[model samples]
Structure formats: structure tokens, C-alpha cells
Target: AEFKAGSAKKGATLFKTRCLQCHTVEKGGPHKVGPNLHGIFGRHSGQAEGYSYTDANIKKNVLWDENNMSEYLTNPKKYIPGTKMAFGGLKKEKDRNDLITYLKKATE
Candidate 1:
């Protein structure tokens, strides 16, 4: 009942439809247009093994936790200006909640 406030099942569907294009969650998954999101939580920004990140992203270097991750997902560019993520952001609070909940399970 950890993520009972949101549906991780729905989040899986959301990930396929909204995030799969540029990201993947499988451990050691290869980078697509964006870096694979495996083990993203508790890591620092731009620390993924071999992904080429913008200087802005490397410099912003913030820890990834639920709160900051939610904020970043709300607006990637605004969160770290010059980041090349190109996502418009998940504007719905419910969507972000659901997705982050799924990531908690899947990305590990």
C-alpha cells in the first residue's frame, strides 16, 4: 500500500505511451534519445554512465528524490535551463504521481 495514492499500473501504461520514446527503465538499458531511467532515484543528475548531457544538466547536479523528481518532471527545461530533455513536462499532478510511483518500483 506504499503508493496507494497513485496507480503504478496506470503509470506503466503512461510510461509506454508518454515516456518510452526517449527513455527506458530496464536496468542497464541502453540510452535512447534520453538516458535510460533505470535507478534514477537517489542518483544525481547527469550521472548516468555514458549519456551525453548538456553542461547545464551536469552543473545543476541535484539529488534525485521524489520531491525533486516530481518538480523536474513538471518542467525539465524550467527546472534546469538549457537541459536538452525536450519534454514539455507532465502537467497533471495525478500523472506525475502515478508515474513517479511506478518508477520507484521499476527503476530499481
Candidate 2:
């Protein structure tokens, strides 16, 4: 349902409701359940300042991008073994696309 018709503005709202409990995309955002999403798009996973990272997350040694983000968000546990994040995943494609779009806007 609503798999590919996401709106970035709506995505932002979705983020506020769903993701805000863990992640933050603001300049001075605090690290809650997850790391602050300040520059998460192009940065390496699990490399946020003052956050603990897992071996699987560090093994990637790569930067974050839309493609990887999509894959990772689909299933965090399946994406990165030993990852600390416990998010199950967004079941809708539209939600992932819109969330990524809003993340780009918020982080950039």
C-alpha cells in the first residue's frame, strides 16, 4: 500500500513520528536510541561521534548512499550483521524513498 508514491514533505512527517524516537537529523540533534543523523548520507555507517559501533558495521568501510540506504533500511538486521540498530524496516517502498528524500534535505 502506497509503495511508490511518497512525498518528501510527508516523509518528513513520517520521520518525525516514527524515526524521531531514535534518530535526529538536525544540526545539534542529540543521539537517542540511534546516532544523530547530521551527515549520515555520505558518511560511513556507525562512525558517528560519541556512538558505539559494531564490527559488522565497521567492516563495510564505506560511505552512505541512497542505494545502500535503501537496502539497509529495508532490513537492518539483514543488511548488516551484528549491527546495533534494531529497526525492523519500512514495509512500503514509498516510505523508504520519501524517507531518504527527506533525510537528504535534512542532512544537507
Candidate 3:
């Protein structure tokens, strides 16, 4: 399916409700749990500002593409064994897709 731009707006709301507590996107937003997600797709994993990342993630050299995000969202712990993100996976595919849409728009 083609990705819809409007889905990104829907994703923004969904992200605020579901992920804002831990993740930030805009500059100057507080980094409560996870790092700021600005420019995350195609960027190196574990490389956010001000937050210390796991060596495992750094060593893996993971990039945030659609497939990688899908896998990570499904099971963060499974994706990065020593990482610190505590939330469980979003089991619904639509939710994940919307989230990807949101991140793409927010970062762009």
C-alpha cells in the first residue's frame, strides 16, 4: 500500500498519546525516557543527543528504515537485547504504520 501523507497527521496524534511520554521529536522537548526521534529514519541507531546509548546498538550499526522500525516496534528488547526502552511492542500493524507515518512527517 502507498503511504499516505494524511496518515502522518493521524500518526502525530497517535504518537502524542502513545509515545510522547518517552520519546521526543521537536527540538527542546524533554527527553524523559527515550531520545528525541528527530531524523530517526535512515539515521544511525543509538546516536541521539545527550543520551548514552548501548554499545550493542552502536556496534550493530542499525539504521531506522521501515523494516527496522517495524521489527523494533514489534519487540524492542528482542531487537536490542541490552537496550533500555521498556514499553512493550505495539502489536497492531496499523498502529505501527501510523507511527511510521507520523515520524516521517515530524522529522521532515
Worst 10 residues of 1 by lDDT: 1-10
Query: What does candidate 2's lDDT look like per residue over 1-108, in tens digits?
Result: 222435789889878988899988887788898889898877887688887778888896668887778777888888787788878888678789898888888887
Clashing pairs in 1: none
Give the Å error, residue 55, model 3. 2.3
TM-scores vs. true structure, each candidate: 0.92, 0.86, 0.83
Error of 2 at 6 (Å): 4.5
RMSD of 3: 2.5
Q: How many steric overlaps are in each model, in order?
A: 0, 1, 0
Worst 10 residues of 2 by lDDT: 1-10
lDDT of 2 at 15: 88
The local lDDT score (0 to 100) that residue 85 gets in candidate 2 is 82
**Candidate 3 lDDT (Cα, 0 to 1):** 0.77
lDDT of each: 0.88, 0.81, 0.77
List the candidate 2 regions with Cα displacement exceeding 4 Å: 1-6
Alpha-carbon RMSD of each model: 2.7, 3.1, 2.5
lDDT of 1 by residue, 1-108 (tens): 122348899889988898999998999999999999898989999999989999999999998888888888889899999998888998888888898888889999
